[PDB]
Design an enzyme around this catalytic site. Structure first.
Site, PDB file in Angstrom:
ATOM      1  N   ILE A 106       1.730   0.887  -8.553  1.00  0.00           N
ATOM      2  CA  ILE A 106       2.474   1.291  -7.376  1.00  0.00           C
ATOM      3  C   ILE A 106       1.619   2.145  -6.447  1.00  0.00           C
ATOM      4  CG2 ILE A 106       4.512   2.513  -6.517  1.00  0.00           C
ATOM      5  CD1 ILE A 106       5.648   2.136  -9.450  1.00  0.00           C
ATOM      6  N   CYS A 107       1.460   1.690  -5.211  1.00  0.00           N
ATOM      7  CA  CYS A 107       0.691   2.441  -4.225  1.00  0.00           C
ATOM      8  C   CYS A 107       1.705   3.307  -3.478  1.00  0.00           C
ATOM      9  CB  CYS A 107      -0.032   1.497  -3.248  1.00  0.00           C
ATOM     10  SG  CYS A 107      -0.966   2.381  -1.955  1.00  0.00           S
ATOM     11  N   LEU A 108       1.707   4.594  -3.792  1.00  0.00           N
ATOM     12  CA  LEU A 108       2.633   5.558  -3.203  1.00  0.00           C
ATOM     13  C   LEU A 108       1.858   6.827  -2.863  1.00  0.00           C
ATOM     14  CD1 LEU A 108       5.576   6.597  -2.669  1.00  0.00           C
ATOM     15  CD2 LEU A 108       5.750   6.973  -5.156  1.00  0.00           C
TER      16      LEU A 108
END
Length: 151
Positions: A86-88
């Site tokens: 997850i790119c957060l």
């Protein structure tokens, strides 16, 4: 008895006393540094009815350094890599040692119906989201059904 493990124990205590809706998670019984969690697809969104399994990996540098979080369930989202990563921003450069497991899961839940358009990890998805929201929701529904095979 390390500081990282002590914080993670507090993280669990807080997550259990008052768990956010559609959010639950716990450290694997053999390693508190590795957790598993579940995010229910937000209510009135295309992810509705989703039962997404996630993996959260912490280091001994926690809470100073964020954990890496990956979806175990298959995913189709602009900000999700092929391996489920997850790119957060709050897990990357907007990270605060004051954020806990509850806050991290909550954000990932909110990120579902509100993709960050900055830099997609998934191109086909960022494309369909902006240029063909009908085909995007189709493939998300496909991922929602498959997520049931997890739990």
């Amino acid at each position: 008895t390390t500081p990282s493990r002590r914080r993670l124990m507090r993280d669990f205590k807080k997550l259990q006393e008052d768990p956010p809706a559609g959010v639950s998670g716990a450290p694997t019984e053999d390693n508190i540094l590795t957790w598993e969690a579940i995010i229910f697809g937000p209510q009135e969104t295309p992810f509705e009815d989703g039962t997404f399994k996630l993996s959260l990996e912490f280091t001994e540098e926690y809470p100073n350094k964020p954990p890496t979080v990956k979806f175990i369930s298959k995913m189709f989202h602009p900000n999700v890599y092929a391996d489920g990563s997850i790119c957060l921003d709050i897990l990357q450069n907007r990270w605060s040692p004051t954020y806990d497991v509850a806050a991290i899961l909550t954000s990932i839940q909110s990120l579902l119906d509100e993709p960050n358009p900055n830099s997609p990890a998934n191109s086909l998805a960022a494309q369909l989201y902006q240029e063909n929201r009908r085909e995007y929701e189709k493939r998300v529904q496909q991922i929602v059904e498959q997520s049931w095979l997890n739990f």
